[PDB]
Amino acid sequence: GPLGSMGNSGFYLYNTENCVFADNIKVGQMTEPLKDQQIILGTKSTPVAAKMTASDGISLTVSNNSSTNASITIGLDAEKAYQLILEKLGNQILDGIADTIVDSTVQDILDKITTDPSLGLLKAFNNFPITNKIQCNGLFTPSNIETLLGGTEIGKFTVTPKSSGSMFLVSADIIASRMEGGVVLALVREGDSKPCAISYGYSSGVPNLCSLRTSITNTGLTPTTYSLRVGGLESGVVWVNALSNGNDILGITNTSNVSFLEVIPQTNA
Amino acid sequence: MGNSGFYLYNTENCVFADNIKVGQMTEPLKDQQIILGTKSTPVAAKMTASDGISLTVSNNSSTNASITIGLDAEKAYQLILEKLGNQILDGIADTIVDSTVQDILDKITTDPSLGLLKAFNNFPITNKIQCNGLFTPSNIETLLGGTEIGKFTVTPKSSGSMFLVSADIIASRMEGGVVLALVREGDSKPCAISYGYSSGVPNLCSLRTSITNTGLTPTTYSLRVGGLESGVVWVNALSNGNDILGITNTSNVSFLEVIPQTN
Amino acid sequence: GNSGFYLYNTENCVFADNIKVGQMTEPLKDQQIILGTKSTPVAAKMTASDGISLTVSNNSSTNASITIGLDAEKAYQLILEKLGNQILDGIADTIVDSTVQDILDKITTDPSLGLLKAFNNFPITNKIQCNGLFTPSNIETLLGGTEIGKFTVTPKSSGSMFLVSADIIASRMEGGVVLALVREGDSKPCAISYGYSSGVPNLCSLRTSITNTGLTPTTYSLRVGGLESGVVWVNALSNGNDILGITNTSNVSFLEVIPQTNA
């Protein structure tokens, strides 16, 4: 019946097609028949057996052993590719993207400065001037010093920290007057049951600055409200911003101050 | 179709047929097949393109037919992204990163609207001054209160800031009060008034206040001290004028830039 | 020069000068290959759309080859001809993120800037009898008064200063109080301030600004005592009792500040 692959050759009839059939083929300038990855490529003269390869690198997938479904698939070399792209035009590309970074990184940083507490620069300050003449009739006694009933309230202020785990350096300096005796200042955080800071000053009967300084530790980035109370030590009337009788000091309107300055505490040891 | 044989095309000894089947081919050439040699005998090979590469042909043209190899465009770039983004930064950042870093730094250290850059200033006062100038309900509102003990010139580095002014002065006088006044140059009256006491012995007499800044421009403040309604007040010295503990002690006045924030 | 079939070792092959199969109307001309179609095969020219490398050595009739590959500028030009925007925003995003992170690092470290300022508060709650006097003699010595605290601070920025506020509850029989801040390794205090008590407790303070000398831990200490005479109680009444019968607090604060030239 059938002859055999390999060795015979001539012309045969494939259906209606009249085909030349051989083991192999050598035509033209080809000094020998086809070898690996070679194909028949005609010049204007007698053709030559070209080999297909990859310049710069290109995916070439040949299936040699397969006599059924054999192919040459062609693709990109990726890491070899983009490298070349850079190695050609990377100099202009950088220029363009730089005249974008100009605003690009800046607006971003300056946004992070202001949005972000954990930076942790950008600290809050607030000062609160107190001008009123106040007759402080509430005393401080050993009985009320651990409670909320010490003295008379002269201010109440709401502070908010811009940075996490920070404190407020607090100075309250208050023009006070009282008939020869001592003056007590209590700073109280709302929520607490007793003052979070106590201090003392003196007046001869003539006005003197009485102050409280302290550093209070901040819980959240939540707004917090401190009241300031003032009274005599165990006995006396104290006037804030006034004389010993409540008249204007020097006939004018005088100012006391309470100020909160955010600060980020280094470890003491 | 029909014939297959050999003929003479000009000077060339040719061969012809309707098709051709060599080597391991079981049938002659079909769609997109080409003759591709192997280590033994040629096989048909169907040219294709991986990773979505352009490979298009023209079969419909019997003459001037051709195959074209092209770019994936979308596929390609999508796969370049799909692999390597890391190298670009480490490779080319430095040249521009030098410029950007060292620029944004200088911007951070110049910009008055950033809210960084807060100036601080400390003016010590080691002189002994007899403060004969009194403070009476009459001069309290004028420029004539007290005796001037110092003057200071400061400059805001930031916009919309305040100065936290501390004035801590060592004073003494016979039993009575000590008034301090801080006056801005160009005003008609003190812009902060304070009070202190001395029983006859040195005592720190202290004024504190927070001032709203009107610019990025050099303001000058003057501090003056003196008796409250009556009495001579000595600064940095005893009740009579000589050294305290027989040394010169210093007083200070300080300006601290702070930047009030909003709730 | 001839045509026909012949034997090459084991292989029986066809040979001719040229070849014309299928729909081909003539043999193979320059840059032509035989490509099988659905019907009979045609002649074909290989080409490159978009631009791709197409290098043929026909001249060399030995090891002759075709090669293909990227054309670079034309390639990417097409890449952006379709996608010329998204690439920008993506890569700019990543690199802006990288440089941003590096800057943040460089701010939170570099002491040469003027950002990063240290703060410390040292509370003092203990009742302390300061029998140490302060007198002409020991004012320039280390023996002035009784030491109520020792503190250690480290600056985070160079050319810096510490804004020191020491506010101490004290009590003594009608007389003056002295406060002295001493740096370790100095022969004398570097800050001397004064206060008063009538017999009831009153805040006595010391304020000063000290110049920092480097970035390394430094240690000051605060001595309190009577002015020339008297016993001074820190944090109590003049008889040592708790004030209002509770523990009280005294404070010493170090705030880092960056000084500007005084005018």
mmCIF file of N, CA and C in Angstrom, chain B residues 183-244:
data_model
loop_
_atom_site.group_PDB
_atom_site.id
_atom_site.type_symbol
_atom_site.label_atom_id
_atom_site.label_comp_id
_atom_site.label_asym_id
_atom_site.label_seq_id
_atom_site.Cartn_x
_atom_site.Cartn_y
_atom_site.Cartn_z
ATOM 1 N N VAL B 183 5.199 98.978 76.506
ATOM 2 C CA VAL B 183 4.673 99.947 75.530
ATOM 3 C C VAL B 183 5.183 99.669 74.128
ATOM 4 N N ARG B 184 4.284 99.611 73.147
ATOM 5 C CA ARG B 184 4.763 99.484 71.764
ATOM 6 C C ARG B 184 5.178 100.842 71.224
ATOM 7 N N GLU B 185 6.308 100.904 70.531
ATOM 8 C CA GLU B 185 6.794 102.175 70.022
ATOM 9 C C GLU B 185 5.835 102.611 68.961
ATOM 10 N N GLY B 186 5.313 103.818 69.150
ATOM 11 C CA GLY B 186 4.370 104.382 68.221
ATOM 12 C C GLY B 186 2.985 104.437 68.802
ATOM 13 N N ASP B 187 2.794 103.908 70.006
ATOM 14 C CA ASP B 187 1.505 104.037 70.675
ATOM 15 C C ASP B 187 1.641 105.102 71.721
ATOM 16 N N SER B 188 0.504 105.424 72.314
ATOM 17 C CA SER B 188 0.362 106.557 73.206
ATOM 18 C C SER B 188 0.313 106.075 74.641
ATOM 19 N N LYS B 189 0.190 104.760 74.796
ATOM 20 C CA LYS B 189 -0.033 104.172 76.097
ATOM 21 C C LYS B 189 0.528 102.756 76.150
ATOM 22 N N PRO B 190 0.842 102.273 77.374
ATOM 23 C CA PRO B 190 1.316 100.897 77.535
ATOM 24 C C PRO B 190 0.328 99.902 76.973
ATOM 25 N N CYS B 191 0.857 98.877 76.320
ATOM 26 C CA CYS B 191 0.021 97.813 75.780
ATOM 27 C C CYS B 191 -0.100 96.535 76.676
ATOM 28 N N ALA B 192 0.568 96.545 77.834
ATOM 29 C CA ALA B 192 0.329 95.540 78.896
ATOM 30 C C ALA B 192 0.757 96.093 80.241
ATOM 31 N N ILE B 193 -0.120 96.038 81.240
ATOM 32 C CA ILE B 193 0.290 96.491 82.583
ATOM 33 C C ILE B 193 0.298 95.364 83.618
ATOM 34 N N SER B 194 1.353 95.306 84.420
ATOM 35 C CA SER B 194 1.461 94.313 85.489
ATOM 36 C C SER B 194 1.783 94.899 86.855
ATOM 37 N N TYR B 195 1.734 94.034 87.864
ATOM 38 C CA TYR B 195 2.033 94.412 89.244
ATOM 39 C C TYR B 195 2.835 93.371 90.024
ATOM 40 N N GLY B 196 3.586 93.867 90.999
ATOM 41 C CA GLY B 196 4.467 93.042 91.812
ATOM 42 C C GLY B 196 4.578 93.677 93.180
ATOM 43 N N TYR B 197 5.386 93.062 94.063
ATOM 44 C CA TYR B 197 5.587 93.558 95.433
ATOM 45 C C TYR B 197 6.992 93.312 95.954
ATOM 46 N N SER B 198 7.372 94.093 96.942
ATOM 47 C CA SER B 198 8.658 93.971 97.550
ATOM 48 C C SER B 198 8.446 94.498 98.932
ATOM 49 N N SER B 199 8.879 93.739 99.938
ATOM 50 C CA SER B 199 8.613 94.146 101.314
ATOM 51 C C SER B 199 9.715 95.048 101.788
ATOM 52 N N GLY B 200 10.744 95.129 100.954
ATOM 53 C CA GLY B 200 11.960 95.872 101.214
ATOM 54 C C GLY B 200 13.072 95.037 100.606
ATOM 55 N N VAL B 201 12.778 93.753 100.407
ATOM 56 C CA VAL B 201 13.775 92.806 99.912
ATOM 57 C C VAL B 201 13.537 92.592 98.432
ATOM 58 N N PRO B 202 14.590 92.184 97.696
ATOM 59 C CA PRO B 202 14.447 91.833 96.288
ATOM 60 C C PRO B 202 13.320 90.829 96.119
ATOM 61 N N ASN B 203 12.555 91.041 95.053
ATOM 62 C CA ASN B 203 11.562 90.081 94.639
ATOM 63 C C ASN B 203 11.419 90.121 93.136
ATOM 64 N N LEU B 204 11.168 88.960 92.521
ATOM 65 C CA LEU B 204 10.842 88.931 91.087
ATOM 66 C C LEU B 204 9.488 89.616 90.876
ATOM 67 N N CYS B 205 9.472 90.636 90.035
ATOM 68 C CA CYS B 205 8.246 91.323 89.663
ATOM 69 C C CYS B 205 8.016 91.041 88.196
ATOM 70 N N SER B 206 6.813 90.599 87.864
ATOM 71 C CA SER B 206 6.645 89.922 86.595
ATOM 72 C C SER B 206 5.403 90.373 85.882
ATOM 73 N N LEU B 207 5.595 90.646 84.589
ATOM 74 C CA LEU B 207 4.566 90.978 83.618
ATOM 75 C C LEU B 207 4.558 89.859 82.597
ATOM 76 N N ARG B 208 3.378 89.460 82.147
ATOM 77 C CA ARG B 208 3.273 88.462 81.095
ATOM 78 C C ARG B 208 2.134 88.889 80.216
ATOM 79 N N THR B 209 2.303 88.755 78.907
ATOM 80 C CA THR B 209 1.180 88.998 77.995
ATOM 81 C C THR B 209 1.382 88.416 76.594
ATOM 82 N N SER B 210 0.283 88.206 75.873
ATOM 83 C CA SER B 210 0.337 87.691 74.500
ATOM 84 C C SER B 210 -0.154 88.747 73.535
ATOM 85 N N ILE B 211 0.686 89.037 72.549
ATOM 86 C CA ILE B 211 0.486 90.105 71.589
ATOM 87 C C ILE B 211 0.180 89.584 70.168
ATOM 88 N N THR B 212 -0.857 90.123 69.494
ATOM 89 C CA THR B 212 -1.099 89.765 68.072
ATOM 90 C C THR B 212 -0.212 90.555 67.118
ATOM 91 N N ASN B 213 0.429 89.849 66.183
ATOM 92 C CA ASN B 213 1.469 90.432 65.339
ATOM 93 C C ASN B 213 0.836 90.989 64.104
ATOM 94 N N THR B 214 1.340 92.129 63.659
ATOM 95 C CA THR B 214 0.708 92.843 62.565
ATOM 96 C C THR B 214 1.483 92.678 61.258
ATOM 97 N N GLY B 215 2.512 91.835 61.253
ATOM 98 C CA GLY B 215 3.351 91.674 60.078
ATOM 99 C C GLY B 215 4.528 90.722 60.206
ATOM 100 N N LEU B 216 5.478 90.858 59.289
ATOM 101 C CA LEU B 216 6.685 90.035 59.280
ATOM 102 C C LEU B 216 7.799 91.026 59.397
ATOM 103 N N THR B 217 7.515 92.025 60.220
ATOM 104 C CA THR B 217 8.278 93.253 60.258
ATOM 105 C C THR B 217 8.729 93.634 61.679
ATOM 106 N N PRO B 218 9.955 94.168 61.800
ATOM 107 C CA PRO B 218 10.641 94.450 63.067
ATOM 108 C C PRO B 218 9.977 95.435 64.044
ATOM 109 N N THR B 219 9.151 94.943 64.971
ATOM 110 C CA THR B 219 8.555 95.801 66.007
ATOM 111 C C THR B 219 9.479 96.058 67.218
ATOM 112 N N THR B 220 9.346 97.256 67.782
ATOM 113 C CA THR B 220 10.150 97.646 68.936
ATOM 114 C C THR B 220 9.282 97.889 70.164
ATOM 115 N N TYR B 221 9.600 97.198 71.251
ATOM 116 C CA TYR B 221 8.858 97.358 72.471
ATOM 117 C C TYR B 221 9.755 97.951 73.538
ATOM 118 N N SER B 222 9.157 98.663 74.481
ATOM 119 C CA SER B 222 9.898 99.284 75.559
ATOM 120 C C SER B 222 9.269 98.885 76.899
ATOM 121 N N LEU B 223 10.098 98.429 77.833
ATOM 122 C CA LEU B 223 9.613 98.087 79.161
ATOM 123 C C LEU B 223 10.050 99.141 80.175
ATOM 124 N N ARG B 224 9.083 99.660 80.928
ATOM 125 C CA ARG B 224 9.393 100.635 81.977
ATOM 126 C C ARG B 224 8.764 100.197 83.293
ATOM 127 N N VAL B 225 9.461 100.467 84.400
ATOM 128 C CA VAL B 225 9.095 100.025 85.746
ATOM 129 C C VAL B 225 9.024 101.198 86.717
ATOM 130 N N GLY B 226 8.187 101.113 87.749
ATOM 131 C CA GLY B 226 8.252 102.128 88.794
ATOM 132 C C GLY B 226 7.257 101.973 89.929
ATOM 133 N N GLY B 227 7.378 102.807 90.966
ATOM 134 C CA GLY B 227 6.477 102.697 92.107
ATOM 135 C C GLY B 227 4.987 102.831 91.776
ATOM 136 N N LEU B 228 4.156 102.098 92.502
ATOM 137 C CA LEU B 228 2.713 102.235 92.339
ATOM 138 C C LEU B 228 2.200 103.405 93.178
ATOM 139 N N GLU B 229 1.957 104.534 92.530
ATOM 140 C CA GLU B 229 1.428 105.732 93.187
ATOM 141 C C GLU B 229 2.400 106.461 94.115
ATOM 142 N N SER B 230 3.476 105.788 94.516
ATOM 143 C CA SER B 230 4.440 106.345 95.458
ATOM 144 C C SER B 230 5.593 105.368 95.757
ATOM 145 N N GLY B 231 6.785 105.914 95.966
ATOM 146 C CA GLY B 231 7.919 105.092 96.348
ATOM 147 C C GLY B 231 8.946 104.958 95.247
ATOM 148 N N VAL B 232 10.199 104.776 95.642
ATOM 149 C CA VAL B 232 11.257 104.547 94.674
ATOM 150 C C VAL B 232 11.478 103.056 94.513
ATOM 151 N N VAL B 233 11.642 102.628 93.274
ATOM 152 C CA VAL B 233 11.810 101.221 92.984
ATOM 153 C C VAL B 233 13.170 100.953 92.343
ATOM 154 N N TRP B 234 13.949 100.096 92.968
ATOM 155 C CA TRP B 234 15.254 99.735 92.447
ATOM 156 C C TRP B 234 15.176 98.452 91.622
ATOM 157 N N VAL B 235 15.817 98.467 90.458
ATOM 158 C CA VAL B 235 15.855 97.284 89.614
ATOM 159 C C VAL B 235 17.242 96.693 89.558
ATOM 160 N N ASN B 236 17.307 95.383 89.799
ATOM 161 C CA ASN B 236 18.540 94.591 89.878
ATOM 162 C C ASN B 236 19.465 94.945 91.047
ATOM 163 N N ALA B 237 18.894 95.560 92.069
ATOM 164 C CA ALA B 237 19.659 96.004 93.211
ATOM 165 C C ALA B 237 18.784 96.026 94.447
ATOM 166 N N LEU B 238 19.364 96.341 95.595
ATOM 167 C CA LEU B 238 18.594 96.430 96.827
ATOM 168 C C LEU B 238 17.876 97.757 96.967
ATOM 169 N N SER B 239 17.189 97.879 98.093
ATOM 170 C CA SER B 239 16.359 99.023 98.404
ATOM 171 C C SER B 239 17.132 100.326 98.343
ATOM 172 N N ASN B 240 18.444 100.251 98.568
ATOM 173 C CA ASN B 240 19.295 101.454 98.609
ATOM 174 C C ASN B 240 20.102 101.673 97.333
ATOM 175 N N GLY B 241 20.116 100.666 96.474
ATOM 176 C CA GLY B 241 20.941 100.723 95.276
ATOM 177 C C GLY B 241 22.125 99.775 95.072
ATOM 178 N N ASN B 242 22.782 99.300 96.133
ATOM 179 C CA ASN B 242 23.954 98.422 95.939
ATOM 180 C C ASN B 242 23.622 96.965 95.596
ATOM 181 N N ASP B 243 24.647 96.219 95.196
ATOM 182 C CA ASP B 243 24.484 94.847 94.716
ATOM 183 C C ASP B 243 23.787 93.903 95.698
ATOM 184 N N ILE B 244 23.056 92.957 95.139
ATOM 185 C CA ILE B 244 22.307 92.021 95.934
ATOM 186 C C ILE B 244 23.208 90.829 96.085
#
